[PDB]
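Bench log, entry 3. Co-assembly request; chain sequences pasted below exactly as received.
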Amino acid sequence: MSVQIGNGLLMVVAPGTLTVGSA
Amino acid sequence: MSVQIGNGLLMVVAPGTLTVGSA
Amino acid sequence: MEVDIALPTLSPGDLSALQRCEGRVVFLETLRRHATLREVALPCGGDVLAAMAAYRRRFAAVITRVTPHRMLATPLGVGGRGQSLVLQNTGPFDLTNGDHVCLVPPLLGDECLRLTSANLELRFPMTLPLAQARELTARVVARAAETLQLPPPHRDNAEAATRSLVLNMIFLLNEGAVILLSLIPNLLTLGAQDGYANAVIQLGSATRELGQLVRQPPPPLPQDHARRFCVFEALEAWIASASRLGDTLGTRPVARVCIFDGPPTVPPGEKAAVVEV
Amino acid sequence: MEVDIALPTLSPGDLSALQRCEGRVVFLETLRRHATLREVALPCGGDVLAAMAAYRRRFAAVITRVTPHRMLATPLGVGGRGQSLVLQNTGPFDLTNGDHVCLVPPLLGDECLRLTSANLELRFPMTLPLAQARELTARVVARAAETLRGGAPARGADVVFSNGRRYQLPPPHRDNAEAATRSLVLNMIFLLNEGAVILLSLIPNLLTLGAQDGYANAVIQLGSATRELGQLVRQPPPPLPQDHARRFCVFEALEAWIASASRLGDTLGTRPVARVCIFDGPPTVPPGEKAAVVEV
Amino acid sequence: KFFTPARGLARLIADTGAAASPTSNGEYQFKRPVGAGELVEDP
Amino acid sequence: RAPVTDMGNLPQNLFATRGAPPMLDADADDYLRRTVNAGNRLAPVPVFG
Amino acid sequence: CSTLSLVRFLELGLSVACVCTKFPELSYVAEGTIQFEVQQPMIARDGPH
Amino acid sequence: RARLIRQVTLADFCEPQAERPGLVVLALRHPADLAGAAYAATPPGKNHRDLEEAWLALDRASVVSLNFLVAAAENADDALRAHVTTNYRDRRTAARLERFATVLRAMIRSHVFPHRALHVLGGLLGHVTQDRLASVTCVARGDQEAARTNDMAARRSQVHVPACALMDVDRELRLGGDDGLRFAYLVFVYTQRHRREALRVHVAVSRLPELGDALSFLLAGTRVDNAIHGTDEADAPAAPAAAAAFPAYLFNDPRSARCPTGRLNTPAAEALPVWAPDMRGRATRNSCMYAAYVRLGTVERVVRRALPLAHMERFTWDVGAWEECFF
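Structure output for the full assembly:
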């Protein structure tokens, strides 16, 4: 009763790298 | 050299839904 | 966003030479995603003041990749505040860390990337440190206003420069300005008592030659000088209108050079990291 | 892109005085992941103009969590996505939501933080809204110019209104206000004087024209198309053989003045560094509190 | 509320008990605040 | 339960309102303002708002 | 260290007041209503009425 | 994503239930410091307490929707007046609009210009309202439709501007250009004639990064008739003395009267020529102020479609600093 949907949130913030580089 | 660790961040904010409903 | 400036067929003896352009900026006219090389192009050297007037109405973009088919780019500033890119120094001066960069048209000409195949040539503008482009632009506009390693002026658009200068200078004259002018003697006598004050005033200050030639009586009190005060209004006008004087004459700063690991200074003709502002 | 600063062994208690400064800005030199406290420090009483010149040759950086070992810092200029960050307000008068903030040295009575045991002092510049930042320096230089000529003492003009209250503008020369701000006053008044006299030398008959028609006519014809009498600017008399003691080429003085005016205008701020975007809080933050700000 | 001249009687009876208090709590009987108002009863 | 508000007396000060044309002798207006506000808890302050 | 005292609305006797019910797509709904229909019993009057 | 601002306030000027989302909102300065700064800012000859009165005649309330402000100006199409009047729920509204008009006309008369009284926020998207107390929420950076409105009919939004005020520039100036990405500028237009003056609002889009000469030519009539009628009510002296002519013949004179420093109080130095620069009543810069603008962001497209409106297209919020336009 303690593990991974905030430890969810926690690991896979992962598949976001662009946050593009362009205006 | 542009894709997915901010496009990392970007997709999988996903495994976080409770942010529980209880005080 | 990325600009795609398509290229026609070029000479293999010159396509390769154009591949040596990876950090030079170009001046588009509109920001459509596609464009053509025939569009972004200026003739050979001439009328440096005309050129610098041209570099304010048309936002620039830096190129990043040159493949035999397309040529990518990047709009310099349209929404970006930290969009890090690379551009190479193509000026005569060096550039150290931190200082802002400015774009000024190419001096003396003769720097034209000639493309006999497409029959069109470019003039990639140079990059100078801010405080030095200031001196350059000031010298050019002063010599242009003189007309009632140096190019000859034109007298046609130099009047635009003279007008833009004299307007901002004239609008400095407020009823409080004479109150600040009524202390030139009182200022000079203070200048000669302390070393710093004497160093502040230059040698050809063009006012030190006034403090010993002309006398002015006490200044007449303006209308309703018992409610408001004109000194503060005058000085606020001065600072607000001087904080942008060089901009409406020269070119605004566009980027400041930052370097995380490399050597502090970048010598001429070498790529340097930069962040746009 | 975050950087820490190495903290020497200061003392008990004083470390707490430092941790209570957890939102103020400090100016790094080169963006390197390891810099020391001895580096980011200036004499706490100094020439405000020189400090303003230094504030541009450097990169801003806001202090995040401080700990007995080190203290992290986030730079402002470089960066991506404009990540937010808490910022402690240290301006005299408060600022409200949604207005651009700017950095100026402690123009008025200074407030240095002094570490006794380390034997080093720090300077923390004020954070003013844009308009009032443009205004306060004019206020103080006007006060200095008034006390320069020995005129009337004061008419009560040493007040500034902002968001209800009114600031007192403490008397000058309390600590060193007369000395720290003298070069600025001189460099400004001398420059305005110079520009005005150069103008008047370039065009002779300006002041003697119609004070309601001729002056206005000159201005409206200049702002419009280029009649300009043709060459309204009269050809000044030619100078001496260039070796005399009284040679005066007005145009070299003109170029020197354009240069100096530009170089002054650069070192005056008047360019936003951040923009407060408070959310989940009081819409106004009083001085000495911490607001969530978004870097421009 | 005695000089302004501003259906069903049951509506009147029900309204008594749902009225918004036209007074603040700032240790002086002031104009009602624009923020909110506790519910009072009055005949 | 106990009365929350006082049952005391507090004379209303009309000089806190707006919409009455002033008396055409300014001196008399100021004399009134001086003789009525002197001792009233409801005397206003010269604050702006 | 103290602990919370969790309370559930159902076990409270007050719940008998309201008929709670779940409605997942409540956020999609504009102003809903309900209906009513009532009669009234009638007396068979006489003569002078 | 984009970042937002929330500011609880009074339902005085922007009324977030009356309009649907997607319209720019402005932040109004505290009026106390305006009334104060007037005391020192109104020019000579004019009144120096009339803004005090104009404000007192309108009695915190902090925001004001552009949809509301555009109505209380000279330029407006009466359809929008009718909309604001009959579509706002609020009591006493038309009277308030009238008073606000008088306020702004006093502001320009007292040389404390409204551009120094209205910072601009983004476009509102959400709100929760008590009885006459609201909490609007507007974007501040990024593009508008990165947000999420609680309408559930149209989650995203756009940006709506009253088409009566939208003045295009390029197609106006005939640059012969081709519409790509264009900037967006909110501009003010002042006009100064004592007791007969007004304010004009516009929303300008173009590719021009630097307005400057563009407005200087666009508003030519305003600058013309403002530079000449602006110095009015200021006592100018009689014909300027000939001593006012600043002597230039004396700079490179080898033989001329001279005086070294350190002997300037009242010595035998009276032989120096007198020159009295005398400037009392001429046109100052604040006298020739006619317009002010501020950058809003970048835009793809503008289409007109319905009360007439003007839907933006991919608006990216990037607010800049204010700008003077006097020369």
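Chains D and F do not touch (no CB pair under 8 Å). Chain D is about 30% helix and 20% strand.
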